[PDB]
Design a protein around this nucleic acid. Structure first.
Ligand code: MG
Ligand code: MG
Ligand code: MG
Ligand code: MG
Ligand code: MG
Ligand code: MG
Ligand code: MG
Ligand code: MG
Ligand code: MG
Ligand code: MG
Ligand code: MG
Ligand code: MG
Ligand code: MG
Ligand code: MG
Ligand code: MG
Ligand code: MG
Ligand code: MG
Ligand code: MG
Ligand code: MG
Ligand code: MG
Ligand code: MG
Ligand code: MG
Ligand code: MG
Ligand code: MG
Ligand code: MG
Ligand code: MG
Ligand code: MG
Ligand code: MG
Ligand code: MG
Ligand code: MG
Ligand code: MG
Ligand code: MG
Ligand code: MG
Ligand code: MG
Ligand code: MG
Ligand code: MG
Ligand code: MG
Ligand code: MG
Ligand code: MG
Ligand code: MG
Ligand code: MG
Ligand code: MG
Ligand code: MG
Ligand code: MG
Ligand code: MG
Ligand code: MG
Ligand code: MG
Ligand code: MG
Ligand code: MG
Ligand code: MG
Ligand code: MG
Ligand code: MG
Ligand code: MG
Ligand code: MG
Ligand code: MG
Ligand code: MG
Ligand code: MG
Ligand code: MG
Ligand code: MG
Ligand code: MG
Ligand code: MG
Ligand code: MG
Ligand code: MG
Ligand code: MG
Ligand code: MG
Ligand code: MG
Ligand code: MG
Ligand code: MG
Ligand code: MG
Ligand code: MG
Ligand code: MG
Ligand code: MG
Ligand code: MG
Ligand code: MG
Ligand code: MG
Ligand code: MG
Ligand code: MG
Ligand code: MG
Ligand code: MG
Ligand code: MG
Ligand code: MG
Ligand code: MG
Ligand code: MG
Ligand code: MG
Ligand code: MG
Ligand code: MG
Ligand code: MG
Ligand code: MG
Ligand code: MG
Ligand code: MG
Ligand code: MG
Ligand code: MG
Ligand code: MG
Ligand code: MG
Ligand code: MG
Ligand code: MG
Ligand code: MG
Ligand code: MG
Ligand code: MG
Ligand code: MG
Ligand code: MG
Ligand code: MG
Ligand code: MG
Ligand code: MG
Ligand code: MG
Ligand code: MG
Ligand code: MG
Ligand code: MG
Ligand code: MG
Ligand code: MG
Ligand code: MG
Ligand code: MG
Ligand code: MG
Ligand code: MG
Ligand code: MG
Ligand code: ZN
Lengths: 138, 83, 208, 99, 124
RNA sequence: AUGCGCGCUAGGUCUCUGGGUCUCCUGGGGGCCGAAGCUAACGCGUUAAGCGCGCCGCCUGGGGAGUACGGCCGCAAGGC
RNA sequence: GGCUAAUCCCCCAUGUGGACCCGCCCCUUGGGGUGUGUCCAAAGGGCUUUGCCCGCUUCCGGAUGGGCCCGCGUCCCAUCAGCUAGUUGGUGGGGUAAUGGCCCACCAAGGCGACGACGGGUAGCCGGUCUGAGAGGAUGGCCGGCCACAGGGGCACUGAGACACGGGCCCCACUCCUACGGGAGGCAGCAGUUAGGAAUCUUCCGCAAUGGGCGCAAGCCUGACGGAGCGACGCCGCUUGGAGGAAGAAGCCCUUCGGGGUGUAAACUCCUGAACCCGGGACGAAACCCCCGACGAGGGGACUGACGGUACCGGGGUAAUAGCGCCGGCCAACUCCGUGCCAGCAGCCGCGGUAAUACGGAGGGCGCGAGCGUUACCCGGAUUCACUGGGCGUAAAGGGCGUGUAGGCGGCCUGGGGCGUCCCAUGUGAAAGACCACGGCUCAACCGUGGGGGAGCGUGGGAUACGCUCAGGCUAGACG
């Protein structure tokens, strides 16, 4: 069984990008659609669309990469240099508004899930609310 | 019987007093119900006595008693003045 | 008590000139002319590259040795400045230059830094009119440093002062020459300061 | 505030008394997982009102006996006997693990 | 170890054992010698080293090294024990404090005199 | 000398065994090379030692020693 | 055995009120009201005695202090796995201020335990401290809070309050008195003695200050306390001089025999003036008392020091203590001489068996400096118990394999709930400490005033993503 699904989307993406795929299909849920809305908005993924695959609905995430490179190893810089889950089933993390983290000195985000919704860090801090801290990205 | 007196908060040769409400039974320098002022003998400061009457009034109302020194200070600061 | 003994030696040891000698640590006798090499028999012998430790060490050495402080005082002063808000190197140097005896030197009442300590000690020095014999005294700007009216006439004091005519004084001060009082207007700065020392090296020295 | 807790009554055998059972989740102080511990409260049923597998509120009271400090406020849920079969069996397992 | 696993078992905070039963906890202990021997060091060196077996105030008995060059110690001397071992002498965990009770500071040693208990040399 | 479960991440080649529109494709199993990646190295590499999540077992310098004592099991041997 | 007083004891009286049984209302655990019925008070003393003060009695309330109860937190060993007879509940009862197996009789047969019961080991707990980048580890001496004990064990009495350290009864050990019958003790109060130990102070001053008991006061008490003494035990400040002064005296060290070194260091020149000696000389201290007004207020207004002739101010005045570790790498600082697997050093690597920068001195050098080394112990380093933050093919480490219990964990959609979670508000988070700010002692150490913070928990309000749950769908997992 998919055991943490969100961690598995984050991972479907991680694997996809390290082999530099153009797109990747991850199985679909509103909470993942949210997690992605934020990625798109934030610049990590190109976007995503929902699709039906043998009837079972999915979402293609479409990934961004840097331009090609020089010398040995032309392979373009990664846009998501990394992405890591935080609250996992069976150890959960929640953060009061005054523990919400500064990610790589701000050059990256942390998706929080909140009472008010699913948000980035600047988002909640300035929104003023805390939550279950899903993951971080740079 | 509850009281209003001086507890000694200074240093050696350099006293300073917290004028406090406490039960007589407690030690001089330990837990006390509320701090109502301070006293400086060598008067090394423009403000060497302070009170906040309304509080001291409240206590006298329910019947703590002062010391002689405490009462001296208090009246000086005019808890007692009825004019 | 502080280090009592051959000084122009430490002039030689840090390889640079930290005049603790006053006059003649100007006029070419400081021996740093024609004997800039360090003390002992091997002072003439070649030098082995310093461990990073050594570097850090002797730069803090210069910074202290200049001021005649004990280390206890020094390092306490330092940690005190680590705590104080904002950049530590500069803060520090501020706190050192703020030392009474130093200021009495800076103001040019005494020739040496140490002669100046003696001066504070016997309290020919007054601060805002109240005499102060404590060389460790912290001058806060706006304070006014005077020579003490009693000793105003002393041979040595007007001695220095006569040679102190027209000379400029460091910009975080001001002086009155014939009237021997002068005011300490601001905490000085890194640039505002001479010092022949990298301070960041000293910070790194207390890193460990 | 007098404290209320909610539990399931796991056994009745006592005259005028029921034993309720109260879980508490709470985060663990280092590892941080949420961990879920329980306690048996001996609670005072005056009327033999409440039965096995009934889920009730318990309220801090003036002591009834040694070990009985709590009385039964009201019935929240009637007849969840799974909870009971759980506790029953947790304890049926002590029968193993010894000599 | 999982986290479930970490709550239900959890880490083991490791103890340690004191390399010195001078013990009682104390920093030095007074004792009385038994044998005063001269002993043969382990494989890498070669020497003759002076040690005393000692009865303690702790109802305890050990060999203790005698630091310094010369010593006056006879079998009934009373002595103070320092602690610290010597790597190459089997069995000795404790040193002896010169200048204290019976063991007297090294004659003529001019140099590390805090150790070795000797006083300061007079001057003309 | 590689705990079980699931998802994910180039291919090639040999092969056992079902289904196909049977140059081949498509499941399931056994080997060998080898992307990316991992690894102290050797190696691992869709039959992970990669990327992940869940849960169990286990480790914490060598010798003393799988000894001693205790307990449990076993007719003994001797086991845990 | 006899005498007698009282604010000592007792009986009537009055009943503002109160207690209690029974009824009734409200309230809702034994809160409040109420109505009949029974029961319950008291002490006098001093004055300027016609009026005041000091008391006394019952009651309601306040306040401060506490009793008991509950949630939650609170070391190690599972080579401690079962523990339990007042033990678990029940009626009725005794006791108490008061709930309770707190105690008792009688009835039922329960209660606890792998979420660690029972057992063994260690331990006063906390504010806080030390350490750490933090998370965390360690600790609880002094100051503050709470507990417990007062030679060992038991028990009550008196009382508002104790099961009582300088109260009592009894058993026990020890010491002392003993006419051998029997008695007297109890420094874990301040000093002090003895022992034990590595080691831990004066048989001081004082009631002036603050506090406490009694007293109308005057006052008495106070080894609380405020001071002084002792010890570098710690922290902070301070001195052993300043400027001049050789192309650099002798001595001592090494030389390549030219000299390099100590080193401006000394000598000496000049100046200041630690110690020390005269003279003033404290604040800490205005109340209690005194008089006016009315013993209020308000107003005035006099006595009152241990520390101490100390602090400090003004005056005169002398060049006036330096020690300790280290110098092979870690680590800042190098050379001759002496020793020759010796004597020794040593924290780890490891030096010494002939030219030793490691041993033992000397010269020189580095580090600190009225200190500086050593030992013991704690944190650190140590991401070496890995929550942050580790691992398990060959380095230590996957159980021989499965079935499956407790337990952990859980696909997609919708809705109720709001337990987790989050936010706001407020209560609590004592003082000291810690951080910030000004300030007070010549600075600091020390102290004061003010500020701000804060995990956690109580309460009320709100949010509903995720987690939980309840209800309803789904089919991609699983089974058929
Ligand atoms: Mg879209
Ligand atoms: Mg984390
Ligand atoms: Mg009390
Ligand atoms: Mg700073
Ligand atoms: Mg800043
Ligand atoms: Mg300026
Ligand atoms: Mg540091
Ligand atoms: Mg029943
Ligand atoms: Mg009962
Ligand atoms: Mg059983
Ligand atoms: Mg594994
Ligand atoms: Mg293949
Ligand atoms: Mg076929
Ligand atoms: Mg295959
Ligand atoms: Mg097979
Ligand atoms: Mg490669
Ligand atoms: Mg890896
Ligand atoms: Mg290969
Ligand atoms: Mg795999
Ligand atoms: Mg071992
Ligand atoms: Mg072993
Ligand atoms: Mg075997
Ligand atoms: Mg056996
Ligand atoms: Mg048998
Ligand atoms: Mg065998
Ligand atoms: Mg056998
Ligand atoms: Mg008679
Ligand atoms: Mg009477
Ligand atoms: Mg009557
Ligand atoms: Mg009445
Ligand atoms: Mg009634
Ligand atoms: Mg009468
Ligand atoms: Mg009352
Ligand atoms: Mg009350
Ligand atoms: Mg209470
Ligand atoms: Mg209360
Ligand atoms: Mg508990
Ligand atoms: Mg403990
Ligand atoms: Mg054993
Ligand atoms: Mg019994
Ligand atoms: Mg009863
Ligand atoms: Mg009683
Ligand atoms: Mg439990
Ligand atoms: Mg403890
Ligand atoms: Mg104990
Ligand atoms: Mg800290
Ligand atoms: Mg710190
Ligand atoms: Mg503790
Ligand atoms: Mg703690
Ligand atoms: Mg204590
Ligand atoms: Mg205490
Ligand atoms: Mg308490
Ligand atoms: Mg006792
Ligand atoms: Mg005793
Ligand atoms: Mg007793
Ligand atoms: Mg009584
Ligand atoms: Mg009484
Ligand atoms: Mg009692
Ligand atoms: Mg008692
Ligand atoms: Mg006594
Ligand atoms: Mg008696
Ligand atoms: Mg002794
Ligand atoms: Mg003392
Ligand atoms: Mg007094
Ligand atoms: Mg008094
Ligand atoms: Mg009178
Ligand atoms: Mg007396
Ligand atoms: Mg005292
Ligand atoms: Mg000092
Ligand atoms: Mg000079
Ligand atoms: Mg010479
Ligand atoms: Mg010469
Ligand atoms: Mg003179
Ligand atoms: Mg006075
Ligand atoms: Mg006065
Ligand atoms: Mg007066
Ligand atoms: Mg008086
Ligand atoms: Mg009159
Ligand atoms: Mg008056
Ligand atoms: Mg007056
Ligand atoms: Mg006097
Ligand atoms: Mg003078
Ligand atoms: Mg001299
Ligand atoms: Mg070196
Ligand atoms: Mg040595
Ligand atoms: Mg020779
Ligand atoms: Mg030689
Ligand atoms: Mg050799
Ligand atoms: Mg040597
Ligand atoms: Mg060495
Ligand atoms: Mg040597
Ligand atoms: Mg030397
Ligand atoms: Mg020391
Ligand atoms: Mg450590
Ligand atoms: Mg650690
Ligand atoms: Mg660390
Ligand atoms: Mg970990
Ligand atoms: Mg954590
Ligand atoms: Mg490892
Ligand atoms: Mg092997
Ligand atoms: Mg292995
Ligand atoms: Mg194996
Ligand atoms: Mg296997
Ligand atoms: Mg299950
Ligand atoms: Mg889910
Ligand atoms: Mg809620
Ligand atoms: Mg709050
Ligand atoms: Mg506070
Ligand atoms: Mg204080
Ligand atoms: Mg100031
Ligand atoms: Mg402070
Ligand atoms: Mg709430
Ligand atoms: Mg909702
Ligand atoms: Mg919902
Ligand atoms: Mg369903
Ligand atoms: Zn010079």
């Amino acid at each position: 069984m998919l055991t943490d699904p969100i961690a598995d989307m984050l991972t479907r993406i991680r694997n996809a990008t390290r082999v530099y795929k153009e797109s990747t299909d991850v199985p679909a849920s509103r909470f993942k659609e949210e997690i992605l809305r934020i990625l798109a908005r934030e610049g990590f993924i190109k976007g995503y669309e929902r699709v039906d695959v043998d009837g079972k609905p999915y979402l293609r995430v479409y990934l961004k990469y840097g331009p090609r490179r020089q010398g040995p190893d032309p392979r373009p810089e990664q846009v998501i240099h990394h992405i890591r889950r935080i609250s996992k089933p069976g150890r959960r993390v929640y953060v009061g508004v005054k523990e919400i983290p500064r990610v790589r000195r701000g050059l990256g985000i942390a998706i929080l899930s909140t009472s008010k919704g699913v948000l980035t860090d600047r988002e909640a801090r300035k929104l003023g609310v805390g939550g279950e801290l899903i993951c971080e990205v740079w | 019987m509850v009281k209003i007196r001086l507890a000694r908060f200074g240093s050696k040769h350099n006293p300073h007093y917290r004028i406090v409400v406490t039960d007589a039974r407690r030690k001089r320098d330990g837990k006390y119900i509320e701090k109502i002022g301070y006293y400086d003998p060598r008067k090394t400061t423009p403000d060497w006595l302070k009170v906040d009457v309304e509080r001291a009034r409240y206590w006298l109302s329910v019947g703590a008693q002062p010391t002689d020194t405490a009462r001296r200070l208090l009246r000086q600061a005019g808890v007692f003045r009825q004019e | 008590g502080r280090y009592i003994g051959p000084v122009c030696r430490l002039c030689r040891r840090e390889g640079v000139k930290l005049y603790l000698k006053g006059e003649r640590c100007y006029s070419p006798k400081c021996a740093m002319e024609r004997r800039p090499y360090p003390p002992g028999q091997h002072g003439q012998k070649r030098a082995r590259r310093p461990s990073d430790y050594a570097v850090r060490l002797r730069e803090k050495q210069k910074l202290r040795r200049i001021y005649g402080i004990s280390e206890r005082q020094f390092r306490n002063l330092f940690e005190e400045a680590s705590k104080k808000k904002g950049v530590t190197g500069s803060v520090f140097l501020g706190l050192l230059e703020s030392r009474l005896d130093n200021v009495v030197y800076r103001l040019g009442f005494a020739v040496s830094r140490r002669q100046a300590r003696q001066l504070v000690r016997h309290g020919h020095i007054t601060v805002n009119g109240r005499r102060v014999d404590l060389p460790s005294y912290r001058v806060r700007p706006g304070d006014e440093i005077a020579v003490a009216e009693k000793s105003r006439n002393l041979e040595l004091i007007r001695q220095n002062l006569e040679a102190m005519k027209g000379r400029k004084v460091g910009p975080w001060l001001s002086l009155d020459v014939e009237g021997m009082k002068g005011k300490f207007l601001r905490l000085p700065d890194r640039e505002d300061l001479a010092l022949p020392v990298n301070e960041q090296l000293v910070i790194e020295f207390y890193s460990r | 505030p007098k404290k209320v807790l909610t539990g399931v009554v796991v056994s009745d055998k006592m005259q005028k008394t029921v034993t309720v059972l109260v879980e508490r989740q709470f985060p663990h102080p280092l590892y941080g997982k949420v961990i879920k511990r329980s306690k048996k409260y001996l609670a005072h049923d005056p009327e033999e009102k409440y039965k096995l597998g009934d889920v009730v509120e318990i309220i801090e009271s003036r002591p009834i006996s040694k070990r009985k400090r709590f009385r039964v406020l009201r019935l929240v849920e009637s007849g969840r006997m799974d909870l009971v079969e759980k506790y029953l069996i947790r304890r049926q397992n002590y029968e193993s693990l010894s000599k | 170890p999982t986290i479930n696993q970490l709550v239900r078992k959890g880490r083991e905070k490791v103890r340690k054992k004191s390399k010195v039963p001078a013990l009682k906890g104390a920093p030095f202990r007074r004792g009385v010698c038994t044998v005063v021997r001269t002993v043969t060091p382990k494989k890498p060196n070669s020497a003759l080293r002076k040690v005393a077996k000692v009865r303690l105030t702790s109802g305890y008995e050990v060999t203790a090294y005698i630091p310094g060059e010369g010593h006056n110690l006879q079998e009934h001397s009373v002595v103070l024990i320092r602690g610290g071992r010597v790597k190459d002498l089997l069995g000795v965990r404790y040193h002896i404090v010169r200048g204290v009770y019976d063991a007297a500071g090294v004659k003529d040693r001019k140099k590390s005199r805090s150790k070795y208990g000797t006083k300061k040399p007079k001057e003309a």
